[PDB]
Amino acid sequence: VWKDADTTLFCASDAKAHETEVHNVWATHACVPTDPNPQEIHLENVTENFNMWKNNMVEQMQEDVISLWDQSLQPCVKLTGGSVIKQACPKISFDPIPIHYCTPAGYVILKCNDKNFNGTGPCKNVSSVQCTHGIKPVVSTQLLLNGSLAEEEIIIRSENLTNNAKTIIVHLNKSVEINCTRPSNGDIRKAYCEINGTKWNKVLKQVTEKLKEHFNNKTIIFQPPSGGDLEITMHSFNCRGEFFYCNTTQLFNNTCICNGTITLPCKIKQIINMWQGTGQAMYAPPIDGKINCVSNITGILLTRDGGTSNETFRPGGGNIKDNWRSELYKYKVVQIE
Amino acid sequence: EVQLVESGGGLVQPGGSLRLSCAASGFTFSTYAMSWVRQAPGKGLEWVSSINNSGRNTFSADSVKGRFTISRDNSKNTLFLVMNSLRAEDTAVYYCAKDLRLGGGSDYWGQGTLVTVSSASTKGPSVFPLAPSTAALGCLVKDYFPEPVTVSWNSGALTSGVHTFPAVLQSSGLYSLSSVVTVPSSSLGTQTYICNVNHKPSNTKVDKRVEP
Amino acid sequence: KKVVLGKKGDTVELTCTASQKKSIQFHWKNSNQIKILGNQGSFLTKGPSKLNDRADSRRSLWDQGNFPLIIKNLKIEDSDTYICEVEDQKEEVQLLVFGLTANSDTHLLQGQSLTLTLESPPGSSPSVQCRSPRGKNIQGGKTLSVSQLELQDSGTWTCTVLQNQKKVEFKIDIVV
Amino acid sequence: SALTQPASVSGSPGQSITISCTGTSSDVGSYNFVSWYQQHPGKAPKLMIYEVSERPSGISNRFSGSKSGNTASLTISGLQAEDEADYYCSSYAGSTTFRVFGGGTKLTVRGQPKAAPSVTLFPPSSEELQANKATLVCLISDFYPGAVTVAWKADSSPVKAGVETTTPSKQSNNKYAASSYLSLTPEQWKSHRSYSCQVTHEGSTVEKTVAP
Ligand SMILES: *[C@@H]1O[C@H](CO)[C@@H](O)[C@H](O)[C@H]1NC(C)=O
Ligand SMILES: *[C@@H]1O[C@H](CO)[C@@H](O)[C@H](O)[C@H]1NC(C)=O
Ligand SMILES: *[C@@H]1O[C@H](CO)[C@@H](O)[C@H](O)[C@H]1NC(C)=O
Ligand SMILES: *[C@@H]1O[C@H](CO)[C@@H](O)[C@H](O)[C@H]1NC(C)=O
Ligand SMILES: *[C@@H]1O[C@H](CO)[C@@H](O)[C@H](O)[C@H]1NC(C)=O
Ligand SMILES: *[C@@H]1O[C@H](CO)[C@@H](O)[C@H](O)[C@H]1NC(C)=O
Ligand SMILES: *[C@@H]1O[C@H](CO)[C@@H](O)[C@H](O)[C@H]1NC(C)=O
Ligand SMILES: *[C@@H]1O[C@H](CO)[C@@H](O)[C@H](O)[C@H]1NC(C)=O
Ligand SMILES: *[C@@H]1O[C@H](CO)[C@@H](O)[C@H](O)[C@H]1NC(C)=O
Ligand SMILES: *[C@@H]1O[C@H](CO)[C@@H](O)[C@H](O)[C@H]1NC(C)=O
């Protein structure tokens, strides 16, 4: 009746041709206009198998996001093996917009609607769509921001939970705001993120309880990342064109799982390691004024130590294909022709 | 300022192939969607294909599906159209176009490249003077294939009074046209008149002097 | 199974090669599944192992599908089997690290003894032989003694440790 | 054409004219990505309006676009001579059809007076005669409006075999010209007393005649 198959998917967006914001500039020319009445058809009585970990939709979104970043970011200096590239580095307008992934003729996208679907296995409530939901291509580590939520319980996704090297995606069912500010005026690189600790620790506590169901009720303990690059030992993200790096030691507080505002210390860095591929880039010092991003934390990226009565987890991230997975897990492409 | 120059068109047999190229300059090619749009002689515009900025995604009209492929080389500022299994109804001027947005309208268009799908042989014209009838004179550009031909007079120096006609397609399958100029009848036997004819498809370039 | 010998204090580079010549996910663990080092996309992560601050890779090579684990300042206890998980593969390499220590002083009077102790890990079965500056080879077990040293025993002694029909070599200067 | 436009519209200088473009609820009805292009003879399309009602920089504010339902409209106020051209609408049409164009509208700007055709008839050149060929050339110039019918005669009788005629187009001075051609052997040419070219414009006829 249909065949699993891969094809070249295109993107669609509500990008504006008059916007100087870089995602708009990219998407107006990478992606078609969104269709104003998207049809979704329930496949009555169908059970279908899915696998979020072998889904070429993720690879294609990855290529587009790299394309977007390669066009849009203007580092003063780009260092890659045998190459120092120098150019002008004016400040840009930067704020992610959603994009949708869509099939050409002959293919359709199947969507798993089982609320507690973990990403692999049979799905009992399947529909066909022309395009995904709108996904913001937000590039971050540790916390997944401005994404979709799980509809019922908190979900744990891993390619293989027993393999301590495989990243665990936690999909939250209630978001918690994180508010990051480099205030106006004066260590210009000093910033911070505020999180309501009551709301956060309640959610973290539910996360701990859910992980307990997968690890035979053992004590769940969080520890800071064990080492590596700053982009992944910190919660890193781009806020208005600036590269923020936020220390998350206090976010993952085992005593709390308090009450008050949690304040994470952040720094805006100019010399960064590039997520798109090998090498480093240098940017200009931060723009003047109040730099602020208020984001919804909708997911968490973790690794488990593995290798007694406890399991130890540490904030993860860096493989930006895990970011796309957290939103594409419910979709797969099939061939009808 | 934007420039787009098409090449690679010409004459091709039915069932044959061509590759059109468009050389882009004046803008950051890699940031724009691009399209090819065609126009058969005497007929309207038809969208053929479009390509997004990176070239990762392409879109083509049903009438060319499976035969034409659009692609681009962003390191060389070039857009291509590979065309296979051509038929008569593919004969057209093919324009390269820079798009306002993918799927949107095209704010800049090249001058286009003519593609003629035919088995008929290339053949340059014969050029005959049309002798002085105030005083009309001209040149008859006879029996050529394929289009186009250009005509000037005294090497671009003589422009008032000049009209060059569109071609007739004879039942032979060959084209003919004429160019004419009306001049001060007193000036004959003092001004030399010469039509400069060029049929680039056959490398025929001729200057004919037109005399009483 | 591949076996690589190293010397206490040196650096060793353990190789891991993928079939596709491009940067992809890999991870190095030891025999107890403790995570040593791997990647997350283009980023380097270092796991909770005891090798944390002496482990590195060569991230220039990742784009050619080569994901080495480089361990510096080797200790006897670094001896273990290491596993590189990449693609559907989990290749193993056993690392055995040896030290050779002079128990005696290295400056000695004529008539004294040279005495050496090979340091070796659990699950190795090595022996040592040493060649005098005169070219005399001498067979030891896990220690090696040369008694009644002479003036002409002054110089570089070249000791060879043998394990898994593989060798490693220690030079030791003695002064009588 | 997937979008429907009137084949022709006309106006006088200073008038306001409007060209419709009717599509369907999956193209004009679904998006606000309608563009309009102006095309003068022999030239590439030029974008006049995009996104229904936006004007590129440098386009006259005499041009405006609008939409109602599945019908878009181009409005040209204070009509000028140089607006005389072909106009095409176009829309996004979803991700499979992609871009659709209208069939085009020829816009003419009237005002000039009736002018009878000046007729010139050239006999065969002796060059063509010795190539054992012969074409009589009838050049029809400086007339308005832009239709004529021509009829050839030899000695007295119509002759329909051998005729090719162009459809009229603008000269530089904005009047029409046209050409008709009679091909024959050198035998036939030499056999009749005379040949005439006979142009009928607005019920009123101008003939020119030639003899060996
Ligand atoms: C769905 O299953 C029910 C029986 O449970 C049946 O009535 C119905 O027709 C099936 N639907 C389709 C599309 O076959
Ligand atoms: C299927 O999932 C959708 C979305 O969650 C919901 O509207 C619907 O009630 C479910 N249908 C069935 C038959 O379970
Ligand atoms: C996903 O569900 C499948 C059974 O459907 C189960 O095998 C798998 O372990 C689940 N994964 C997680 C991380 O719970
Ligand atoms: C979220 O998930 C947990 C189960 O993991 C459940 O206890 C809690 O009620 C859910 N929260 C909401 C807001 O639905
Ligand atoms: C899951 O991970 C474990 C532990 O590392 C491993 O033994 C097993 O082979 C893995 N499963 C699959 C399907 O690869
Ligand atoms: C964000 O934090 C800043 C600094 O404390 C504060 O001014 C602002 O009101 C906060 N905004 C929100 C929406 O919490
Ligand atoms: C923290 O969140 C709780 C839970 O909603 C809320 O009631 C409280 O007012 C918030 N704290 C602050 C400082 O706003
Ligand atoms: C994070 O802050 C903690 C608590 O102050 C500090 O000990 C730690 O080293 C910081 N981590 C990083 C990666 O900078
Ligand atoms: C953990 O939270 C407790 C209670 O608020 C606080 O005393 C402690 O300092 C926090 N520890 C860290 C490392 O942030
Ligand atoms: C998340 O989305 C909000 C709402 O658009 C935006 O203001 C904020 O900057 C976003 N966060 C990030 C990190 O892009």
Nearest CA residue ID for atom 7, ligand 6 = A181
Question: How far is Cα A318 from Cα A236, in angstroms, rounded to an integer?
Answer: 9
Residue type, A250: Q
Strands C143-146 and C114-119 come out as antiparallel
Quote the longest CA-to-CA distance of chain B: 67
Q: At what angle do helices A22-30 and A56-72 cross, to 10 degrees?
A: 130
Phi and psi at B135, nearest 5°, equal: 55, 100
SS3 category, A46: coil
Q: Does residue D104 sit in the same domain as residue D125?
A: no
Q: Which residues of A touch C29 (CB under 8 A)?
A: 164-165
DSSP-assigned letter for residue D115 = B
Strands A99-102 and A271-273 come out as unpaired
Spell out the SS3 assignment of B63-124.
CCCCCEEEEEECCCCEEEEEECCCCHHHCEEEEEEEECCCCCCEEEECCCEEEEECCCCCEC
Dihedral of the alpha carbons of D6, D12, D17, D23, in degrees to the nearest 10 = 10
Residue type, A304: R
Interface test with C, best of A61, A278, A302 (most C CBs within 10 A): A278
> Of B101, B104, B136, which has the smallest distance from its Cβ to D139's Cβ?
B136
Answer yes or no: are the C-beta atoms of A159 and A322 closer than 8 Å: no
The alpha carbons of chain B give a radius of gyration, in whole angstroms, of 21
Which residues, at least 6 apart from B184, have a Cβ–Cβ distance to it below 8 Å? Answer: B134, B135
Q: Which residues of A touch C85 (CB under 8 A)?
A: 163, 165
Pull the structure tokens for residue D210. Answer: 């030639």
Pull the structure tokens for residue D112. Answer: 């000039």
Which residues, at least 6 apart from C58, have a Cβ–Cβ distance to it below 8 Å? Answer: C13, C66, C68, C70
User: Can the peptide bond before residue B148 be classed as cis, meaning omega within 30 degrees of 0?
Assistant: yes
Q: Which residues of A touch D92 (CB under 8 A)?
A: 32-33
Question: How far is Cα D47 from Cα D56, in angstroms, rounded to an integer?
Answer: 8
How many domains are contained in chain D? 2
Q: Does residue C48 sit in the same domain as residue C107?
A: no
Q: Which DSSP string corresponds to A297-311?
A: EEEEEEEE-----EE
Closest residue by Cα to residue C37 from A153, D8, A232: A232
C-alpha dihedral sign at B5, B7, B11, B16: negative
Question: How far is Cα C130 from Cα C114, in angstroms, rounded to an integer?
Answer: 11
DSSP-assigned letter for residue A119 = S
Q: Which domains does chain A have, with CATH numbers?
A: 1-337 (2.170.40.20)
Pull the structure tokens for residue C107. Answer: 């400056």
Instruction: CATH 2.60.40.10 in chain B: give the residue spans.
Output: 1-119, 120-212
Domain that holds residue C143: 99-173
Q: Distance, CA A137 to ligand 10 centroid (Å)? A: 11
Answer yes or no: are the C-beta atoms of B146 and B118 closer than 8 Å: yes
Q: Does residue D22 sit in the same domain as residue D101?
A: yes
Q: Does residue C92 sit in the same domain as residue C124?
A: no
Q: Count CA within 13 A, CB hemisphere, residue B188.
A: 16
Answer yes or no: are the C-beta atoms of A33 and D92 closer than 8 Å: yes
In chain A, alpha helices (H):
22-30, 56-72, 197-214, 230-233, 320-328
Ligand (nearest to CA of A41): 2
Q: Which DSSP string corresponds to D64-86?
A: EEEEETTEEEEEE-S--GGG-EE
* Interchain contact A229–C (C-beta under 8 A): yes
SS3 category, A131: strand
Question: How far is Cα B126 from Cα B123, in angstroms, rounded to an integer?
Answer: 10
Q: Does residue D41 sit in the same domain as residue D119?
A: no
* CA C167 to each of CA C11, C79, C173: distance values in angstroms, whole numbers, following the listed order: 16, 15, 20
Closest residue by Cα to residue A46 from A122, A133, A152, A118: A122
Q: Which residues of C touch A163 (CB under 8 A)?
A: 85
Question: How far is Cα A155 from Cα A157, in angstroms, rounded to an integer?
Answer: 6
Dihedral of the alpha carbons of A53, A57, A59, A63, in degrees to the nearest 10 = -160
Question: How far is Cα C159 from Cα C117, in angstroms, rounded to an integer?
Answer: 11
* CA B19 to each of CA A142, B86, C57: distance values in angstroms, whole numbers, following the listed order: 49, 11, 47
Counting as contact any 3 or more CB pairs under 8 A, the partners of C are: A
DSSP-assigned letter for residue C21 = S
Closest residue by Cα to residue D64 from D108, D3, D18, D104: D18
Q: Does residue C161 sit in the same domain as residue C77?
A: no
CA A238 to ligand 10: nearest atom: 13
C-alpha dihedral sign at A266, A267, A268, A270: negative
Q: How many residues does chain D have?
A: 212
Domain that holds residue D164: 112-212
Closest residue by Cα to residue A325 from A138, A149, A119: A119
Among the candidates D76, D111, D146, a domain finishes at D111
Q: Does residue C114 sit in the same domain as residue C81?
A: no
Q: Does residue C89 sit in the same domain as residue C113?
A: no
How many domains are contained in chain C? 2
Residue type, B171: S
Q: Which DSSP string corresponds to C44-87?
A: EEE-SSTTGGGEE--TTGGGGTB--EEE-S--GGG-EEEEEEET
Technique used: X-ray
Pull the structure tokens for residue D76. Answer: 């040209």
Q: Does residue C76 sit in the same domain as residue C1?
A: yes
Question: How far is Cα D34 from Cα D49, in angstroms, rounded to an integer?
Answer: 8
Question: How far is Cα C146 from Cα A92, in angstroms, rounded to an integer?
Answer: 75
Fold of B120-212: Immunoglobulin-like (2.60.40)
Nearest CA residue ID for atom 14, ligand 7 = A196
User: Can the peptide bond before residue D41 be classed as cis, meaning omega within 30 degrees of 0?
Assistant: no
Q: Does residue D99 sit in the same domain as residue D131?
A: no
Among the candidates D111, D146, D173, a domain finishes at D111
Q: Which helix (H) or strand (E) holds D94?
A: helix D94-97
> Of A164, A231, A312, which has the smallest distance from its Cβ to C43's Cβ?
A231
Question: How far is Cα D172 from Cα B169, in angstroms, rounded to an integer?
Answer: 24
Q: Distance, CA A177 to ligand 9 centroid (Å)? A: 20
Question: How far is Cα A251 from Cα A201, in angstroms, rounded to an integer?
Answer: 8
Q: Which residue has the tokens 């022309």?
A: A130
Question: How far is Cα D159 from Cα D156, in angstroms, rounded to an integer?
Answer: 9
In D56-85, the residues whose Cβ lies within 8 Å of chain B are 56
Chain breaks in chain A (C to N over 2.5 A) after: 185, 257, 307
Answer yes or no: are the C-beta atoms of C130 and C143 closer than 8 Å: no
Q: Does residue C137 sit in the same domain as residue C84?
A: no
CATH code of B1-119, in short, is 2.60.40.10
Closest residue by Cα to residue A285 from A182, A192, A194: A182
CA A256 to ligand 9: nearest atom: 2
Question: How far is Cα A191 from Cα A180, in angstroms, rounded to an integer?
Answer: 7
Q: Pocket around ligand 9: residues whose beta carbon is below 6 Å from it?
A: A 249-250, 253, 255-256, 258
Whichever domain contains C15, its CATH number is 2.60.40.10
Among the candidates C98, C128, C153, a domain finishes at C98
SS3 category, B56: coil
Q: Distance, CA A120 to ligand 3 centroid (Å)? A: 6
Question: How far is Cα C130 from Cα A282, in angstroms, rounded to an integer?
Answer: 55
Q: How many residues does chain B have?
A: 212
Q: Please tell me what resolution, in angstroms, this structure has.
A: 1.9
Nearest CA residue ID for atom 4, ligand 9 = A258
Q: Does residue C119 sit in the same domain as residue C88?
A: no
> Of A167, A307, A321, which has the smallest distance from its Cβ to C33's Cβ?
A307
Q: Looking at D27-186, which runs of residues are DSSP E strands?
A: 34-39, 46-49, 63-68, 71-76, 85-92, 99-101, 105-109, 118-122, 135-143, 149-154, 157-158, 163-165, 169-170, 176-183
Among the candidates D111, D132, D164, a domain finishes at D111
Number of Cβ within 10 Å of residue A149's Cβ equals 15
SS3 category, B31: helix
Answer yes or no: are the C-beta atoms of A133 and A100 closer than 8 Å: yes
Q: Which DSSP string corresponds to C102-144?
A: ESS-SB--TT--EEEEEE--TT---EEEEE-TTS-EEE-SSEE
Strands A32-33 and A10-13 come out as parallel
